[PDB]
Each structure stands twice: as C-alpha cells, then as structure tokens.
Design a protein around this ligand. Sequence first.
Ligand SMILES: COc1cccc2cc(C(=O)N[C@H](C(=O)N[C@@H](Cc3ccccc3)[C@H](O)C(=O)N3CSC(C)(C)[C@H]3C(=O)NCc3c(C)cccc3C)[C@H]3CCOC3)oc12
Lengths: 99, 99
Amino acid sequence: PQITLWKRPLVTIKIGGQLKEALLDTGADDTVIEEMSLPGRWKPKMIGGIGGFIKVRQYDQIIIEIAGHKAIGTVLVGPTPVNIIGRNLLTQIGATLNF
Amino acid sequence: PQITLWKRPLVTIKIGGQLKEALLDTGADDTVIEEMSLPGRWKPKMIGGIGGFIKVRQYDQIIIEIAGHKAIGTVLVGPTPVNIIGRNLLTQIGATLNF
Ligand SMILES: COc1cccc2cc(C(=O)N[C@H](C(=O)N[C@@H](Cc3ccccc3)[C@H](O)C(=O)N3CSC(C)(C)[C@H]3C(=O)NCc3c(C)cccc3C)[C@H]3CCOC3)oc12
C-alpha cells in the first residue's frame, strides 16, 4: 500500500494468534508492544524516546504479521504507550519513505 | 526521493535561518526541534511518548525546508533528544510510507 500521513499510520498486526493495532513508526529503531506473553527467553534492554527511557523485555525471532505481511524478528515488550512497529520490522516488509 | 529504513532516515532541514539534521518520523504527530529561537508568539505544550512527557514551546506558521522541500506549519521547540519532523510537516512535503 501507499500510506499517507494525514492520520496516524495505524495498521493491524497479528502476534501470538491475536490481532492488535500498531503504529508504523519510521522514527523507532525497534518494535515495542504493550504487555503480553511471548514464548522463550528474554534479554534486558532500555529504550530512549521523547520523555526519557523505559525498560523492556527483548524477545528474538518472534513471528509477527504487519498489515498482512509476514515477518520474524525482534519484539520488545514493556510499558510503551502504543504498539510501535519500528525499522527492524519495517525493513522486513519492504517499507520505504517516498516524496 | 525513496528513503530506505536500514538506518535512521535523517535529512538536512533549514529552519530559522539555521541548518539542522532531523529525523523523518511517521510515529510523531508533531515536529519538535532542539532549543533555538523562532519568531512570533508561542504557547506552552506537553508532548509524550517513550519515557513520558516533556514541555515545549509551540510556534505556529513556521516556514521550513526539509530535504529541499518547503512547507509551513507548527514547530515545537524544547528538550528533544533528536530533531523530529513529524506528520504535520511530512504531509506537506508529500511523504508517504510504501510497501
Ligand atoms: C533518548 O532516546 C534517543 C536518543 C538518541 C537517539 C535515539 C533513537 C531512539 C528511538 O528510536 N527511540 C524509539 C522512539 O521512541 N522513537 C520515537 C521518536 C524519537 C526518536 C529519538 C528520540 C526521541 C524520540 C518515535 O518515532 C515516536 O515518534 N513516538 C514513539 S511513542 C509515540 C508514538 C507517542 C511517538 C512520540 O514520541 N511522540 C511524541 C511527539 C513528538 C516526538 C513530536 C511531536 C508531538 C509528539 C506527541 C523507541 C521506540 C521503539 O524503538 C525505540 O531514541 C533515541
């Protein structure tokens, strides 16, 4: 698709068999989702954004669909205010900015 | 241009007579720049994201050049860690996300 920016670029994702709303965010290095259960071991990470930092749990090699496009990659879980799809997964789905 | 997302999508902007580097950020509603002077009236605003909120100054009707493309809109000024071009100005330069 071609997504314009007059409104927030929200899409549906699927993760853990569940549909969720998430923001396609070219300003985010990483993908971070609100609290949920994911399989496997996690590693610690801190991420730093407009307000300061939050602590999150890093899960690797997680199956995730973004607007119907399949990806498998790193998903961070923690107290983010919205679900954010960042560049690590935007690149998997072939997204570019164009003007 | 077509900008890939392998690295942060940073571009040169001209604002207030100054050259700055800034991030093309589809996750940002607003545009926020590190401390600088701008003309005209302003009012205070709080903006929030990862790590919470910061206080900024809101200037309206500010001319800007983003990667060679002119526009006008509201520009926020305050203690942002990164200069951010958000959707309010990305629309005006014709930027879309494509996949
Ligand atoms: C101290 O922090 C940083 C320092 C130096 C470099 C980086 C790079 C990043 C980064 O990529 N941070 C991401 C991030 O929060 N990026 C955000 C932008 C940003 C980048 C660098 C520094 C600071 C912010 C995001 O693109 C956005 O706009 N978000 C994510 S949360 C959001 C959807 C609410 C929105 C927001 O903050 N909006 C606030 C906002 C802005 C920025 C402008 C105008 C109005 C508002 C409301 C997190 C999220 C997952 O990956 C890591 O942080 C950095």
